[PDB]
Design a protein around this ligand. Structure first.
Ligand code: MG
Lengths: 49, 147, 100, 280, 55, 50, 218
């Protein structure tokens, strides 16, 4: 009798912290590109990475 | 007495025509086939089992070869007539003779999605449970102890 | 009448032609399994010999897909009807809501 | 050595909700009896259900009358849920006549002596015109299980009157069963449990009369524990009533008696032309 | 119980001549009044022929 | 909000209840999810296909 | 026809062993197969009269984790072998036997003292093996009468007494037809016994035990 419920899919507790760190990093790694240091292609390849 | 008499009898559906049909059904194979016949396992021979209803029952282990789920699929039934046709259905394309794919020797009757879950639940190993750490005389005693 | 909906059942039910929406308000004067008679208020009545409203509900008939199309009244005698209310439920309709 | 259970108490929460007890039970017999009794109380219990109701002004369930808000199909649908209790016979034909504005409950049905209406406020129809009336004949029967009208297509007994409307028959009066085993009193002996069966029905059967019938059926099934008119009057004048006595003798022997007539001989010849009887 | 024909194919043949010889045997049993060499449990000519094939 | 609505009535906030087998009266482990789903009947009937 | 239930005809009672049978009840009513099968299986498993071994003490051993020279087995293995012993105790409720023997060779059930009413059904049953010329074995086996399987934790060395003489039972419902209806059941019972009683007798015993519980209602 193995069912599937809404609690059977637990969200990790530190996902919010990872998302916050990632968005805080992105909020400045784009401005670093806006200063003319790196090109758009390499910036895109770094963001996707 | 005559063919017309038997025709009228079958038309009226007497209680004896069912016991007569069971005789011819006992050991007469039929061929099942799903619409896209990619490889040769899309046509296999089975032994009919008379059931009440209007749907065909298909063994859940031959669904991989037919590539058939149960969300609306239909299949066609063909009846061999001559002696050679029945012998070929029994000795060449019977469902129990085609368990290895002709593309690679690996089998094609592997269970999935319902049978593997139950066996995975049986052969599991918990840490703390009732009746842990004892000695049984054999598997029948384990079955008795579980039931 | 699905217990869990989205709130878009009223619009789908009414905007289609399956139900019987009241043209003018009033009071149900004669309800029946096949007809509904509404007595219109004096203000909504036209000046010259306006009269009443009569709705002939469609009974068992066939669709393009050979399905039944019949309406059923959801009102009673004396009930005050307002302009725009649902007076009959067509196929797959429950008190003016889509119910499939 | 087994303490057999007894019918200790039978509670009554309402006309339909009951609660029985089957003290005392030994270890391992509580569930063994509870499940086996539930599966029988749910499956096979006798009852009475409406079927074959005929209305005067209708020809099929897909029609509609005048001065009635409900539909004929809805009427046949809410007649299905009529809780009737019949003790005298197993086939009754009721009658329902009423006129005037107002609902049509189950009280308005006829007041036959051997027919009890369990729920008189069971609304059947609604009239919406003072110049309207309904008249029908409700045929109640007795059986068990569920028998739909679609199975009554034998067409080998009689023909259907156009105005006769078949109804699905839910004979089973029981609605649900919920038993629960629990520890009984000390009783100066441990390992004694009780069985508390909690049934519910449409108020057409008694809890004790249902348990004593379920147990009777269980015992009867478990008992298998062993190893292994002138044409007819011409023939009846000679004390011959069955066709076998007439077929035992040839037609020549039957024609040698003055008791047989011309019409009887013609009927015998017409019956024998089909090679069914009177073949010597 | 003719569930499989494994042993019959293992004994002799190339799985093709077996069908022909069984057809000949079943035809001689059905049309011709030749008595079967094995007891029949309400079986047909094909199953009896396949069961007689083994020796 | 679904949990609060389940708590208004006398219902388990988890969503899963314990069921019993109907053929043996035994109880399934791992309490299963029981509720009300809105099912539909599609116009693909076996009467028009056999 | 309101109380006209069908009755099975168990023509198939075929068995391929002395203590193993396969009964086939056909035809039953829809839903009675599972009911009857489960009831009789539960009764045959959890409540069945019989006698088995409860506790055995050794002459010079007072612990489970010990050993005696000259024996090819261990204390656990000989206790497990004593669990499989089948004894049909007659007359008295319980009796204590002995296993006093000093000889090279396997110790069979025939080496146990007769002790009168005690009748061993499996004289070929081997308890332990001996190899030394001077290694002697001595124990006091104690039988007892009960119903069911009682483990050790529920209760000198303890033994899980298997009072019920049934080794296993597993029913299987199928489909049966009488000339019109394919919704009828077909009960098939499979059971192996330990040799004390035939399984055909155990079915009758369980059916009688179940039927005697329904006297106050029928
Ligand atoms: Mg598909």
């Amino acid at each position: 009798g193995a069912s599937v419920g809404i609690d059977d899919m637990v969200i990790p507790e530190k996902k919010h912290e990872i998302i916050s760190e990632a968005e805080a990093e992105v909020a400045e790694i784009q401005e670093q590109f806006q200063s003319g240091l790196v090109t758009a292609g390499e910036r895109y390849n770094k963001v996707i990475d | 007495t005559t063919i017309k008499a038997a025709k009228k009898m079958v038309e009226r559906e007497e209680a004896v025509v069912w016991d007569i049909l069971d005789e011819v059904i006992r050991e007469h194979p039929v061929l099942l086939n799903r619409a896209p016949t990619l490889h040769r396992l899309g046509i296999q021979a089975f032994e009919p089992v008379l059931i009440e209803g209007k749907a065909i029952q298909l063994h859940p282990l031959v669904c991989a070869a037919y590539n058939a789920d149960f969300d609306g699929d239909q299949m066609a039934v063909h009846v061999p007539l001559t002696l050679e046709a029945q012998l070929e259905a029994r000795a060449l394309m019977m469902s129990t003779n085609n368990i290895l794919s002709p593309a690679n020797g690996e089998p094609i009757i592997v269970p999935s999605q319902d049978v593997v879950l139950g066996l995975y639940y049986m052969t599991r190993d918990c840490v703390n449970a009732k009746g842990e750490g004892m000695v049984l005389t054999g598997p029948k005693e384990a079955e008795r102890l579980y039931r | 009448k699905p217990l869990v909906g989205t709130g878009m059942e009223r619009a789908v039910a009414v905007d289609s032609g399956v139900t019987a929406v009241a043209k003018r308000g009033g009071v149900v004067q004669y309800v029946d399994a096949s007809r509904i008679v509404i007595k219109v208020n004096e203000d909504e009545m036209y000046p010259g010999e306006a009269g009443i409203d009569i709705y002939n509900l469609t009974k068992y008939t066939r669709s393009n897909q050979n399905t039944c199309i019949n309406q059923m009244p959801c009102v009673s005698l004396g009930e005050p009807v307002e302009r725009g209310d649902v007076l009959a439920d067509g196929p797959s309709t429950d008190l003016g809501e889509l119910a499939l | 050595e087994f303490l057999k259970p007894r019918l200790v108490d039978i509670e009554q929460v309402s006309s339909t909700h009951a609660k029985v007890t089957l003290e005392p039970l030994e270890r391992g017999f509580g569930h063994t009896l509870g499940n086996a009794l539930r599966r029988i109380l749910l499956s096979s219990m006798p009852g009475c259900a409406v079927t074959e109701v005929e209305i005067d002004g209708v020809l099929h369930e897909y029609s509609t009358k005048e001065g009635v808000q409900e539909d004929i199909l809805e009427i046949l649908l809410n007649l299905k849920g009529l809780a009737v209790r019949v003790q005298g016979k197993d086939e009754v034909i009721l009658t329902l006549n009423k006129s005037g504005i107002g609902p049509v409950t189950a009280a308005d049905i006829t007041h036959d002596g051997d027919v009890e209406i369990v729920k008189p406020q069971h609304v059947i129809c609604h009239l919406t015109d003072e110049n309207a009336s309904i008249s029908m004949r409700i045929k109640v029967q007795r059986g068990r299980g569920y028998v739909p009208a679609s199975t009554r297509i034998h067409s080998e007994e009689d023909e259907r009157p156009i105005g006769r409307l078949l109804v699905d028959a839910c004979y089973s009066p029981v609605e649900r069963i919920a038993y629960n085993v629990e520890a009984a009193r000390v009783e100066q002996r441990t390992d004694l449990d009780k069985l508390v069966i909690e049934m519910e029905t449409n108020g057409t059967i008694d809890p004790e009369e249902a348990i004593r019938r379920a147990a009777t059926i269980l015992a009867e099934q478990l008992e298998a524990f062993v190893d292994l008119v002138r044409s007819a009057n011409c023939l009846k004048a000679e004390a011959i009533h069955y066709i076998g006595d007439l077929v035992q003798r040839t037609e020549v022997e039957l024609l040698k008696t003055p008791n047989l007539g011309k019409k009887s001989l013609t009927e015998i010849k017409d019956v024998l032309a089909s090679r069914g009887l009177s073949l010597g | 119980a003719r569930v499989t024909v494994q042993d019959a194919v293992e004994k002799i043949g190339n799985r093709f001549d077996l069908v022909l010889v069984a057809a000949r045997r079943a035809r001689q049993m059905q049309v011709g009044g030749k008595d079967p060499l094995v007891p029949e449990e309400n079986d047909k000519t094909t199953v009896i022929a396949l069961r007689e094939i083994e020796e | 909000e679904i949990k609060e609505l389940l708590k208004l009535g006398d219902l388990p906030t988890s969503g899963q209840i314990r069921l019993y087998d109907g053929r043996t009266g035994e109880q399934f482990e791992r309490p299963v999810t029981v509720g009300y789903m809105y099912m539909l009947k599609l116009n693909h009937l076996v009467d028009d296909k056999m």
